[PDB]
Design an enzyme around this catalytic site. Structure first.
Site, PDB file in Angstrom:
ATOM      1  CB  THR H   1      -0.947   0.036   1.219  1.00 48.07           C
ATOM      2  OG1 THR H   1      -1.719  -1.170   1.267  1.00 48.07           O
ATOM      3  CG2 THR H   1      -1.889   1.225   1.135  1.00 48.07           C
TER       4      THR H   1
HETATM    5  C1  LIG Z   1      -6.045  -0.907   2.136  1.00 40.08           C
HETATM    6  C2  LIG Z   1      -5.089  -1.930   2.706  1.00 40.08           C
HETATM    7  C3  LIG Z   1      -4.818  -3.053   1.732  1.00 40.08           C
HETATM    8  N1  LIG Z   1      -3.965  -4.094   2.291  1.00 40.08           N
HETATM    9  C4  LIG Z   1      -3.648  -5.192   1.600  1.00 40.08           C
HETATM   10  O1  LIG Z   1      -3.990  -5.365   0.435  1.00 40.08           O
HETATM   11  C5  LIG Z   1      -2.841  -6.267   2.327  1.00 40.08           C
HETATM   12  N2  LIG Z   1      -3.722  -7.359   2.726  1.00 40.08           N
HETATM   13  C6  LIG Z   1      -4.747  -7.244   3.583  1.00 40.08           C
HETATM   14  O2  LIG Z   1      -4.831  -6.349   4.422  1.00 40.08           O
HETATM   15  C7  LIG Z   1      -5.884  -8.252   3.424  1.00 40.08           C
HETATM   16  C8  LIG Z   1      -5.602  -9.283   2.329  1.00 40.08           C
HETATM   17  C9  LIG Z   1      -6.853 -10.063   1.984  1.00 40.08           C
HETATM   18  N3  LIG Z   1      -7.886  -9.365   1.539  1.00 40.08           N
HETATM   19  O3  LIG Z   1      -6.882 -11.285   2.109  1.00 40.08           O
HETATM   20  N4  LIG Z   1      -6.334  -8.847   4.683  1.00 40.08           N
HETATM   21  C10 LIG Z   1      -5.624  -9.757   5.364  1.00 40.08           C
HETATM   22  O4  LIG Z   1      -4.488 -10.106   5.053  1.00 40.08           O
HETATM   23  C11 LIG Z   1      -6.321 -10.363   6.585  1.00 40.08           C
HETATM   24  N5  LIG Z   1      -5.555 -11.437   7.197  1.00 40.08           N
HETATM   25  C12 LIG Z   1      -5.498 -12.669   6.696  1.00 40.08           C
HETATM   26  O5  LIG Z   1      -6.063 -12.988   5.651  1.00 40.08           O
HETATM   27  C13 LIG Z   1      -4.706 -13.644   7.426  1.00 40.08           C
HETATM   28  O6  LIG Z   1      -4.291 -13.352   8.547  1.00 40.08           O
HETATM   29  C14 LIG Z   1      -4.352 -15.008   6.865  1.00 40.08           C
HETATM   30  C15 LIG Z   1      -2.920 -14.965   6.326  1.00 40.08           C
HETATM   31  C16 LIG Z   1      -4.512 -16.105   7.932  1.00 40.08           C
HETATM   32  C17 LIG Z   1      -4.129 -17.485   7.433  1.00 40.08           C
HETATM   33  C18 LIG Z   1      -6.632  -9.282   7.624  1.00 40.08           C
HETATM   34  C19 LIG Z   1      -5.419  -8.818   8.392  1.00 40.08           C
HETATM   35  C20 LIG Z   1      -5.192  -9.207   9.702  1.00 40.08           C
HETATM   36  C21 LIG Z   1      -4.083  -8.769  10.408  1.00 40.08           C
HETATM   37  C22 LIG Z   1      -3.173  -7.919   9.806  1.00 40.08           C
HETATM   38  O7  LIG Z   1      -2.079  -7.495  10.515  1.00 40.08           O
HETATM   39  C23 LIG Z   1      -3.374  -7.496   8.488  1.00 40.08           C
HETATM   40  C24 LIG Z   1      -4.500  -7.966   7.812  1.00 40.08           C
HETATM   41  C25 LIG Z   1      -2.431  -6.588   7.770  1.00 40.08           C
HETATM   42  C26 LIG Z   1      -1.864  -5.465   8.377  1.00 40.08           C
HETATM   43  C27 LIG Z   1      -1.011  -4.622   7.676  1.00 40.08           C
HETATM   44  C28 LIG Z   1      -0.693  -4.875   6.348  1.00 40.08           C
HETATM   45  C29 LIG Z   1      -1.222  -5.993   5.740  1.00 40.08           C
HETATM   46  C30 LIG Z   1      -2.108  -6.823   6.423  1.00 40.08           C
HETATM   47  N6  LIG Z   1      -2.489  -7.871   5.583  1.00 40.08           N
HETATM   48  C31 LIG Z   1      -1.699  -7.913   4.503  1.00 40.08           C
HETATM   49  O8  LIG Z   1      -1.536  -8.861   3.741  1.00 40.08           O
HETATM   50  C32 LIG Z   1      -1.111  -6.499   4.328  1.00 40.08           C
HETATM   51  O9  LIG Z   1       0.215  -6.619   3.835  1.00 40.08           O
HETATM   52  C33 LIG Z   1      -2.034  -5.630   3.457  1.00 40.08           C
HETATM   53  O10 LIG Z   1      -1.285  -4.541   2.920  1.00 40.08           O
END
Ligand SMILES: CCCNC(=O)[C@@H]1NC(=O)[C@@H](CC(N)=O)NC(=O)[C@@H](NC(=O)C(=O)[C@@H](C)CC)Cc2ccc(O)c(c2)-c2cccc3c2NC(=O)[C@@]3(O)[C@H]1O
Ligand SMILES: CCCNC(=O)[C@@H]1NC(=O)[C@@H](CC(N)=O)NC(=O)[C@@H](NC(=O)C(=O)[C@@H](C)CC)Cc2ccc(O)c(c2)-c2cccc3c2NC(=O)[C@@]3(O)[C@H]1O
Ligand SMILES: [Mg+2]
Ligand SMILES: [Mg+2]
Ligand SMILES: [Mg+2]
Lengths: 244, 242, 244, 231, 222, 248, 204, 196
Positions: H1
């Site tokens: 991001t």
């Molecule tokens: C506008 C912001 C966009 N961010 C992204 O696109 C990126 N992706 C996500 O936030 C989406 C991906 C999706 N939709 O699956 N959610 C999750 O990953 C979710 N978590 C999971 O699925 C899991 O725990 C699995 C592996 C369990 C087997 C929610 C969660 C929970 C704790 C957490 O600390 C985070 C996100 C997080 C914090 C900071 C940065 C990132 C994070 N997660 C990234 O991967 C990240 O790098 C993001 O930048």
């Protein structure tokens, strides 16, 4: 039937809530308190009956502050007014904690109004025995409000309640009709002193002490401050001369 | 007996507290009406500011519930503001939960259900108010829905509420009987406001200055209230008519 | 507060009676008569419907006789809805006992639980009692066949034959007149139908005004038979009360 | 009459009759006086006994090393209120390392008594209080009524026959208000004041109770033989 | 699992495979992964199968109650918000990964919901273990202004790619098409490309092969 | 603070429950409604008495769908009926649909609503519901059924009945016109006739509300592709259909 | 070790021509130690049969709970519950304990009393429903049962043939599992007749 | 991001990428990380997509209620709501949020709220995994009171660098311009910002 006036939330066949009106009576028994809106703030004034010379002058303060910009004075049951001020202080703290900005005067007015109105919904609580004049300066200027035991409240150019409310409202109507441009904060302080001295005629039995506070954007920098010392003495002299 | 104090049935099967709350709705001695244009909804209410010490800008019984819903109340201002705050909260929560703006009739039904709860539970008294909700719903178009202390609610082609409610209702009935349509055939909301003010002047038999009225207009995606000068312009346009 | 509207439903009269219990019994005294008769080889329940209309659907109708489990049934006299509340709680208690002990619940335990619920309603909570009287007909492997009665007071007693509801004085007189300890279930059926026909406030004892049930042996197993309208008509023509 | 069944009921005139009945319960209590100069504050209380075989009930309660009060009316209510005041002083000291100001103590007592007069259930307190204290702004004397009204004065008196003492204080004001640095003279003034409320009775070591607080003098109660030097 | 959703000029299509697995063992060869939230709002689920079924059923029940209360057709954004807030409340412990499609008075909509509560919007979506295969087809063949049959074939081909190239996906292809004007049409087993061949033998045993110790009749009447 | 924890309905020395009697009075002073059970369906009907010609009667529905196979009409206080319909729609889900995956049979939904109303006659600080309900439903194992639920919480199955002001005359007419071989259209016609006597003013498809529990209409389902899922058994008649049937 | 393998056991259900069959093993043990030879895992409520593999205490608890629920269902509905409705009830009751479930693998079998259609279904421990047309397997020898069924089964089997088929599947699957066996029972279910046979198998 | 918000003479512009990743897989390549909480108060979200979306929805609810009760809220008030939510739930949240608003009184403001719930008012603010790679660059190119075109060029170049170096960033560049003239949405495709 009969007996509708015995419970707090009960409608009478004429549609009224007689308990609120008995609270209004309790308010009408109280001393005179007034508020005057000026071109950049508000002034609050109250008569304090000297029950005895054993009372320490300038102590027993009646005007209360809410946050740092709101002034509140009330006529009626003083403890009920203090309770309402405590609630208002909680509401202002909550509003500031959530939204950072100090609570705007209309928002605070509606908070007090909703509280008082809620106190007319159940037979397990008694309505407030006070009418409350309050207000201050916010981002949109000066605001003065008056709130009745029914929870009803309005914004006023000038407001007055208590035993001498009649003559006070007369003087306020005269001031409003004669000054469409608006009073200044200091001129409004002097006029508040005069109106308290005049409305004391309806409570002329005992001697009184005058208490004045004000919230002016220029004279107090938007903060609520008590009028003390030289300005208070000058307003007292103005009133003494004008009633004689 | 005490069947006149709490919301329990009288031997006649009545709820006298509900009836007395209905009575209290008229305490303010204010009449209001609501009509629907082609693509708008207008509400008119009498504005009476007797005390010269009052700030006339704070004397209002028309409320902005949301971006789309406006509500005018016939009753004392404490219960009016009670209902207004509750309706605003309900609309905000509805939007947060269901992802779209609360419709006019749905908010009306919610407020009516709360009034019914007050009608059946003894510890809650009724609100001595009548709530007229107006909007241009994205599914139903111009909408008028009204609730009362009995928990009743319904939609209207047009409506009126107040001490002289019956006269206004008859006036609007006669007009719609002559026009044979269920709305005001006008493309501009200004002309619908003019219609409403004209027919209220007729029904009440009184003339109004710009400080004798509150006007609320609801169009697609916005409800607003008119200024004293906007009301004055409408009054001038009415005066220039025949 | 709200104390002025409190009927005080769980207080004593100066004579030591429960007002609401007495008034609920007075209410039940106008309900359709229900009779239970216990024989050596079975139990019979017979209850009378009140003010039945011709358009009433008697096939799927049930206002008097309810199954609690497969070995216990009840005849109700009074408010049907209160009865159904108590019936559901009793069914739940029976299933709880079954789940806990892997044995069917003895009749007296269920009866005493329901009676204790009633007693609770007559001593605390400030609520009105259930306007219901129950005749329990059951079988367990400790006391065999059992017939119990319970009333709004929470009192329950055992009976060879008993009646509840309207005209219980005359019905009990007739039952005591014709009951023998050795009689069989069919003789009990005859006795119950004859008592109902002699005590009914209606013109004649027709089938559409009757609910009937028998707990019999038929194998070492007990059978609950709730009579269908045609079966009631047939047993009526068998007893000679009605003509074919 | 029909409006005195509870505290949650206004009369058609606008009165709260339960609060007035509590005030009456006060007016039947034994007399006590308070008066302060600019360096000290003194409490003089006349104690009342059941009979000649009984004790004279305590009327002065210590709340903190700088604050105390005298009661008139229902003693258990005074105990409740003085315990609340003790906790408030204690909270101030423990959390802020700050002696509780007498003015804020009066405000707290007012707000405590008020909530018993607006909600169903309960009752107003049946006691009146005279609070003396020495804080960052000097000596202070407060009068508390269970209506919630609390007022600061130079002197006052509550209980039966209190008007004689109160009018004496109104006369003696210019004299006692400047008894600074002389505690015994302020106590003499207090005893002279309470003497006005005596009808067919005189002060003994058994029925006289005095209390004093002020600059370099913690709140101390004199009872029994100690007050013999003021009789 | 392979689930996909594709918008077309006048509606939206969703599709899924029918393979349900307990680890490496095929538990169900004909599993319906397309759930009906409302008559014109459907949803494909992946992850914990019980969780997907449960959340879709619960939100559909609440949506039906809401639609009766509001006297309106349900909106896709409403089901989206309810599923989102429910899945978020449970911190991803409700292992449901959903693709929600539907037509409502405001038009046609296609969304995806992650088990932690995050939502995505697009014209073509895929979720599940086979998504990377299905998405590979989508990014290769998707274009704006797809016709109904074009989008149906695209979704079917994405699901087929998932079926062939993912071990967690297989068997049949279920489709649900939702057009602006028509009813939603639910094509169960729109494709059946994994019919089992005829076995080389019949293993019917001669009666009496199994040794019995005792037999008895059990009563089921009451 | 809710301090009304005691019953507002108590037994009088005569044995009556006064508030239930008064609720029944309120029901008797309400507009007449009725239900008729045919061999292939059930009909429920009532009169839509609007206050003003400006009021839109179509917005307020006196005949409500409870489940796809169960509908309800009422006589008495409208708002009580509306909140009861909401509660019944929710209880049909929480207490059944979410446990067995199927909609409840008519008897059990009726029993749930009756439990609600009974509790309203005994819980603390509440008054009974001032309505009587006629619930018409169809389930697979009991067929078509028609129940009446009263303010006390009692319910009775009816071959045909009516409630409200014109209940006595309507009941007599139904008794003299009902048989056990009536088709659905026959019951519709007899219901229209019975309504025609209790309605003082206009009598047309816009002033009366009538619905049926008949056959499954798959066109009202909204989706296709599940052979086991048929349309709802409940259907409200439109003003056009009512007026067409008023010609005869 | 883990709760689903402490006691061991297997249940398997199959469908034929106007009939179903449900069989289970008889073993109850504590890991290596065999404890009881008479621990049957198939119960019946009305005409709906339910086998339960897994943790034995949860098997017994679920049997008692479903007896409770089906008794109340019969009292309220005035009819016996059908296999589909009982399947839904089992699924909802299992999911009710989503984050602390019973360690079981239920199997429902029966004949719909109205339509006469045979019905079988299986569930995981949180209630996911697999309504198979052919067969359902559960227990510590679930893989062996899967292989045996996928090999042996053919549709439209007559009851006397379905019995042999399900018995061979159950037996040859149990003989490759250390925790299954120790006897077996088989129910053959026709719309108006249920027979129950005990199988002879190796006792090791 | 990769997200940023920059104040300039006419108001404020928010910019972000469109890449949502699950691990090293791009779950979404057209993500809209520019979220509206009020007519002229928006936010750039970074971190947990679920957490940021939930926080933004709750803040939009709070601001809608605030508008219905007291009118248009200040940008500071929206930042305060975001701050309260992020600070009081710092143990279960992973959301970095840039709040950017415009009113006719303050002419546009930017508040950054990183992990932990602290809030900082800045002329411009950058956040996200890509933001690191552009710190230096931004500190060398930002000036006060730039023009709309100057601000759009600044944001485009900064986000182009962030996308180039950070694998978590990519897709298109989204921008939201808040001025007295209103709200404008801008999109820039890879074929345009990669040559920069
Ligand atoms: C506008 C912001 C966009 N961010 C992204 O696109 C990126 N992706 C996500 O936030 C989406 C991906 C999706 N939709 O699956 N959610 C999750 O990953 C979710 N978590 C999971 O699925 C899991 O725990 C699995 C592996 C369990 C087997 C929610 C969660 C929970 C704790 C957490 O600390 C985070 C996100 C997080 C914090 C900071 C940065 C990132 C994070 N997660 C990234 O991967 C990240 O790098 C993001 O930048
Ligand atoms: C529409 C989606 C369809 N999904 C599938 O068919 C696939 N299968 C299931 O979800 C069905 C299969 C069935 N019939 O039991 N449930 C289980 O497996 C159940 N598991 C068990 O019984 C056991 O643990 C035993 C040993 C006791 C301890 C429940 C459980 C528990 C934990 C868990 O992490 C998951 C599922 C899970 C999470 C995400 C993804 C998958 C999961 N399980 C897959 O195998 C999966 O890959 C699914 O995709
Ligand atoms: Mg509601
Ligand atoms: Mg073995
Ligand atoms: Mg061995």
């Amino acid at each position: 039937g009969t007996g509708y006036d015995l419970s707090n939330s009960v409608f009478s066949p004429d549609g009224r809530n007689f308990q609120v009106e008995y609270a209004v009576k309790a308010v009408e028994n109280g001393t005179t308190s007034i508020g005057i809106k000026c071109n950049d703030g508000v002034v609050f004034a109250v008569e304090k009956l000297i029950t005895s010379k054993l009372l320490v002058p300038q102590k027993n303060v009646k005007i209360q502050v809410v946050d740092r910009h709101i002034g509140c004075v009330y006529s009626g049951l003083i403890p009920d007014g203090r309770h309402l001020v405590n609630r208002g202080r909680e509401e202002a703290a909550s509003f500031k904690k959530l939204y950072k900005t100090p609570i705007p005067i209309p928002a605070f007015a509606d908070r007090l109004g909703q509280y008082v109105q809620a106190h007319t919904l159940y037979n397990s609580v008694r309505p407030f025995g006070v009418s409350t004049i309050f207000g201050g300066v916010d981002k949109n200027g000066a605001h003065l409000y008056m709130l009745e035991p029914s929870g009803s409240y309005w914004g006023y150019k000038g407001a007055a309640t208590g035993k001498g409310r009649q003559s006070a409202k007369a003087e306020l109507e005269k001031l409003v009709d004669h000054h469409p441009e608006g009073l200044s904060a200091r001129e409004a302080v002097k006029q508040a002193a005069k109106i308290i001295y005049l409305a004391h005629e309806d409570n002329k039995e005992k001697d009184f002490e005058l208490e004045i506070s004000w919230c002016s954007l220029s004279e107090t920098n938007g903060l609520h401050k008590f009028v003390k010392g030289d300005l208070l003495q000058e307003a007292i002299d103005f009133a003494q001369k004008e009633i004689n | 007996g005490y069947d006149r104090h709490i919301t329990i049935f009288s031997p006649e099967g009545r709820l006298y507290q509900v009836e007395y709350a209905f009575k209290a709705t008229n305490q303010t001695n204010i009449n209001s009406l609501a009509v629907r244009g082609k693509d708008c909804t207008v509400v008119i209410s009498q504005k009476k500011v007797p005390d010269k010490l009052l700030d006339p800008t704070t004397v209002s019984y028309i409320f902005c519930i949301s971006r789309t819903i406006g509500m005018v109340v016939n009753g004392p201002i404490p219960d009016a503001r009670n209902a207004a705050l509750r309706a605003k909260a309900e609309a905000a929560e509805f939007r947060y939960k269901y992802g779209y703006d609360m419709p006019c009739d749905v908010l009306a039904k919610r407020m009516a259900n709360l009034s019914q709860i007050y009608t059946q539970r003894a510890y809650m008294r009724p609100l001595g108010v009548i709530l007229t909700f107006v909007s241009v719903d994205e599914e139903l178009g111009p909408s008028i829905y009204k609730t009362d202390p009995a928990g009743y609610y319904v939609g209207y082609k047009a409506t009126a509420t107040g001490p002289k409610q019956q006269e206004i209702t008859t006036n609007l009935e006669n007009h719609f009987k002559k026009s044979k349509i269920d709305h005001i055939n006008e493309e501009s909301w200004e002309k619908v406001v003019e219609f409403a003010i004209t027919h209220m002047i007729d029904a009440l038999g009184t003339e109004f200055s710009k400080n004798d009225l509150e006007v609320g207009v609801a169009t697609k995606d916005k409800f607003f209230t008119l200024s004293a000068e906007n009301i004055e312009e409408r009054l001038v346009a009415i005066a220039e008519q025949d | 507060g709200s104390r002025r509207y409190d009927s005080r439903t769980t207080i004593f009269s100066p004579e030591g009676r429960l007002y609401q219990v007495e008034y609920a019994l007075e209410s039940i005294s106008h309900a359709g008569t229900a009779i239970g008769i216990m024989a050596s080889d079975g139990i019979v329940l017979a209850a009378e419907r009140k003010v039945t209309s011709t358009l009433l659907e008697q096939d799927t109708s049930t206002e008097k006789l309810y199954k609690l489990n497969d070995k216990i049934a009840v005849a109700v006299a009074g408010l049907t809805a209160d009865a159904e509340i108590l019936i559901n709680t009793a069914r739940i208690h029976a299933q709880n006992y079954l789940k806990t002990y892997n044995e069917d619940i003895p009749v007296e335990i269920l009866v005493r639980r329901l009676s204790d619920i009633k007693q609770g309603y007559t001593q605390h909570g400030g609520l009105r009692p259930f306007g219901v009287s129950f005749i329990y007909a059951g079988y367990d492997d400790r006391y065999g066949y059992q017939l119990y009665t319970s009333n709004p007071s929470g009192n329950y007693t055992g009976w060879k034959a008993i009646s509840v509801g309207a005209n219980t004085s005359a019905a009990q007189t007739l039952l005591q007149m014709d009951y023998k300890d050795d009689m069989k279930v069919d003789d009990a059926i005859e006795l119950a139908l004859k008592t109902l026909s002699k005590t009914t406030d209606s013109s004649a004892l027709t089938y559409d005004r009757l609910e009937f049930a028998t707990i019999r042996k038929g194998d070492g197993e007990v059978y609950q038979k709730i009579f269908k309208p045609q079966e009631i008509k047939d047993i009526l023509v068998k007893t000679g009360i009605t003509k074919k | 009459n029909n409006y005195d069944g509870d505290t949650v009921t206004f009369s058609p005139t606008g009165r709260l009759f339960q609060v007035e009945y509590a005030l009456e319960a006060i007016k039947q209590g034994s007399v006590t006086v308070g008066l302060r100069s600019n360096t000290h504050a003194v409490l003089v209380a006349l104690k009342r006994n059941a009979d000649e075989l009984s004790s004279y009930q305590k009327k002065i309660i210590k709340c903190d090393e700088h604050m105390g009060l005298s009661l008139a009316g229902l003693a258990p209510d005074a105990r409740v209120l003085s315990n609340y005041l003790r906790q408030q002083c204690n909270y101030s000291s423990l959390v802020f390392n700050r002696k509780l100001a007498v003015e804020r103590a009066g405000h707290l007592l007012c707000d405590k008594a008020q909530k018993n007069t607006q909600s169903y259930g309960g009752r107003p307190y049946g006691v009146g209080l005279l609070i003396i204290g020495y804080d960052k702004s000097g000596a202070h004397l407060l009068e508390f009524q269970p209506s919630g009204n609390v007022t600061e004065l130079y002197g006052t008196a509550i209980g039966a026959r209190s008007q004689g003492a109160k009018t004496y204080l109104e006369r003696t004001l210019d004299t006692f208000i400047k008894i600074d640095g002389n505690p015994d003279e302020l106590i003499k003034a207090g005893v002279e004041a309470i003497s006005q409320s005596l009808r067919d009775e005189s002060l003994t070591v058994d029925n006289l109770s005095i209390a004093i607080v002020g600059k370099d003098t913690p709140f101390t109660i004199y009872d029994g033989e100690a007050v013999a030097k003021y009789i | 699992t392979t689930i996909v959703g594709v918008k077309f000029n006048n509606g939206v299509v969703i599709a899924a495979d029918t393979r349900s697995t307990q680890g490496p063992i095929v538990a169900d060869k004909n599993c319906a992964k397309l759930h009906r939230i409302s008559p014109k709002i459907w949803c494909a689920g992946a992850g914990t199968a019980a969780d997907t079924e449960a959340v879709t059923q619960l939100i559909g029940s609440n949506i039906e109650l809401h639609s009766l209360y509001t006297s309106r057709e349900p909106r896709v954004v409403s089901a989206l918000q309810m599923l989102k807030q429910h899945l978020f409340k449970y911190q991803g412990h409700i292992g449901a990964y959903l693709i929600v499609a539907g037509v409502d008075p405001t038009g046609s909509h296609l969304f995806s919901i992650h088990a932690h509560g995050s939502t995505d919007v697009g014209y073509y979506l895929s979720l599940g273990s086979g998504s990377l295969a299905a998405m590979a087809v989508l990014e290769s063949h998707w274009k704006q202004d797809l016709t109904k049959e074009e989008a149906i074939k695209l979704a079917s081909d994405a699901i087929q790619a998932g079926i062939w190239n993912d071990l967690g996906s297989g068997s049949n292809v279920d489709v649900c098409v939702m057009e602006i004007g028509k009813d939603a049409e639910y094509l169960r087993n729109y494709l059946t490309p994994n019919v089992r061949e005829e076995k080389q033998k019949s293993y019917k045993f001669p009666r009496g092969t199994t040794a019995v110790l005792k037999e008895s009749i059990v009563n089921i009447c009451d | 603070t809710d301090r009304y924890s005691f019953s507002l309905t108590t037994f009088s020395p005569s044995g009556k429950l006064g508030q239930i009697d008064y609720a029944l009075t309120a029901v008797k002073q309400g507009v007449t409604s009725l239900g008729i059970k045919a061999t292939n369906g059930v009909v429920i009907a009532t009169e839509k008495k609007s206050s003003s010609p400006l009021a839109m009667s179509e917005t307020l529905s006196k005949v409500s769908l409870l489940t796809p196979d169960i509908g309800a009409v009422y006589s008495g206080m409208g708002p009580d009926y509306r909140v009861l319909v909401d509660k019944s729609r929710k209880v049909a889900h929480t207490s059944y649909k979410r446990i067995y995956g199927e909609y409840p049979p008519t008897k059990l939904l009726v029993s749930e609503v009756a439990k609600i109303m009974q509790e309203a006659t005994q819980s603390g600080g509440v008054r009974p519901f001032g309505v009587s309900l006629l619930i018409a439903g169809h389930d697979e194992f009991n067929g078509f059924s028609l129940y009446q639920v009263d303010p006390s919480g009692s319910y009775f199955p009816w071959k045909a009945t009516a409630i409200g002001k014109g209940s006595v005359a309507a009941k007599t007419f139904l008794e003299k016109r009902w048989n056990d071989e009536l088709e659905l259209e026959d019951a519709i016609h007899i219901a229209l006739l019975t309504l025609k006597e209790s309605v003082e003013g206009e009598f047309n498809g816009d002033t009366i509300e009538l619905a049926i529990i008949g056959d499954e209409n798959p066109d009202l389902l909204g989706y296709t592709g599940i052979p086991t899922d048929k349309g709802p058994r409940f259907r409200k008649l439109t003003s056009q259909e009512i007026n067409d049937r008023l010609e005869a | 070790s883990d709760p689903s393998s402490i006691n061991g056991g297997i249940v398997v259900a199959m469908t034929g021509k106007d009939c179903v069959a449900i069989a289970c093993d008889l073993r109850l043990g504590s890991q290596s130690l065999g404890v009881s030879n008479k621990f049957e895992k198939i119960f019946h409520y009305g005409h709906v049969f339910l086998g339960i593999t897994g943790l034995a205490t949860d098997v017994t608890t679920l049997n008692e709970m479903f007896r409770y629920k089906t008794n109340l269902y019969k009292l309220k509905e005035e009819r016996a519950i059908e296999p589909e409705t009982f399947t839904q009830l089992v699924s909802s009751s299992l999911y009710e304990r989503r984050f602390g479930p019973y360690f079981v693998g239920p199997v429902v079998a029966g004949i719909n009393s109205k339509s006469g259609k045979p019905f079988i279904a299986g569930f995981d421990l949180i209630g996911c429903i697999d309504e198979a047309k052919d067969f359902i397997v559960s227990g510590t020898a679930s893989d062996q049962l899967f292989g045996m069924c996928e090999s042996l089964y053919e549709p439209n089997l007559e009851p006397e043939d379905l019995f042999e088929t399900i018995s061979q599947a159950l037996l040859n699957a149990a003989d490759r599992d250390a925790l299954s066996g120790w006897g077996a029972v088989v129910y053959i279910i026709k719309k108006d007749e249920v027979v129950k046979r005990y199988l002879k198998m190796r006792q090791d | 991001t990769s997200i940023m918000a920059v104040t300039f003479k006419d108001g404020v512009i928010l910019g972000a990428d469109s890449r949502t990743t699950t691990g090293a897989y791009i779950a979404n390549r057209v993500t809209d990380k520019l979220t509206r909480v009020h007519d002229k108060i928006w936010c750039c979200r970074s971190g947990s997509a679920a957490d940021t979306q939930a926080i933004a929805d709750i803040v939009q609810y709070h601001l809608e209620l605030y508008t219905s009760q007291y009118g248009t809220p200040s940008t500071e008030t929206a930042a305060s709501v975001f701050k309260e939510l992020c600070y009081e739930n710092k143990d279960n949240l992973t959301a970095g949020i840039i709040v950017a608003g415009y009113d006719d009184k303050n002419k546009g403001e930017v508040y950054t709220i990183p992990l932990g719930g602290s809030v900082h008012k800045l002329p411009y603010a950058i956040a996200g995994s890509g933001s690191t790679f552009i710190y230096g660059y931004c500190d060398k190119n930002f000036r006060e009171n730039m023009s709309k075109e100057e601000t759009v060029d600044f944001i485009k170049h900064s986000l182009s660098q962030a996308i180039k170096w950070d694998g978590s960033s990519g897709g298109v560049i989204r921008m939201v311009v808040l001025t007295a003239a209103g709200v404008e949405r801008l999109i820039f495709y890879p074929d345009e910002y990669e040559q920069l």
